[PDB]
Amino acid sequence: GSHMASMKKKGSVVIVGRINLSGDTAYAQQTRGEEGCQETSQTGRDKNQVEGEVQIVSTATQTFLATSINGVLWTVYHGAGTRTIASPKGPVTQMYTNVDKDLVGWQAPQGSRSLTPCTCGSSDLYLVTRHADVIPVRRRGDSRGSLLSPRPISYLKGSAGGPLLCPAGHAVGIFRAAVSTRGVAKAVDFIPVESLETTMRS
Ligand SMILES: [Zn+2]
């Protein structure tokens, strides 16, 4: 049994900022502070204007990234779970949920812009972090790339759900997890865009 009257629900994922990639300079912009984030997570009602391809998103416990590709805002299951996302009309249910791929998605919010999936086959990639660093990554397999310059795992914490891009700025994948030893990240695991395309039926 249980005390049914006191049963709580997890809040929505809330967009709290974006990574601006539109000019020649990448930078993180915050669009909501912590108090507003908490309120918005509970109501699921977010009237803020959305712009851009890469959103900074938060739950009650974590902050990470989400990336629009082909009109779907994608992120990692390990960050978002099965949560709704806050929107101007209230909570929006996930359109895709795949724990096996560590992948979830919602319909892309009005005002967002989407990346296009890469078709170039290039192995020279670029990872965009939550701090708007653009880090060169050499692709090493279907789902892995090496950092040209290794760094402490702290640097990548909170970047899950962000994009890996080809030289032409098309989406190659979604960052999933760092590969590290003794706290040093030398590589990254990612969800390849073809996996998203198959999920979408595109
Ligand atoms: Zn490409």
Domain locations along the chain: 1-115, 116-202
Q: Resolution of this entry in Å? A: 1.3
The set of residues, in sequence order, having a beta carbon less than 8 Å from that of 154 and lying 6+ positions away, is none
Ligand 1 centroid, distance to 7 Cα (angstroms):
48
Q: Is 37 assigned a ligand-binding role in the annotation?
A: no
**For residues 187 and 192, what is the distance between their CA atoms, to the nearest angstrom?**
15
Task: Give 197: exposed, middle or buried? Use CB within 10 Å, 0-12, 13-18, 19+.
Answer: middle
Ligand 1 centroid, distance to 165 Cα (angstroms):
7
Q: In 3-state terms, what secondary structure has residue 163?
A: strand
Is 1-115's fold the same as 116-202's?
yes
A 10 A CB-CB count for 139 gives: 20
Q: Which fold would CATH assign to domain 1-115?
A: Thrombin, subunit H (2.40.10)
Ligand 1 centroid, distance to 189 Cα (angstroms):
18
Q: Which fold would CATH assign to domain 116-202?
A: Thrombin, subunit H (2.40.10)
Method: X-ray
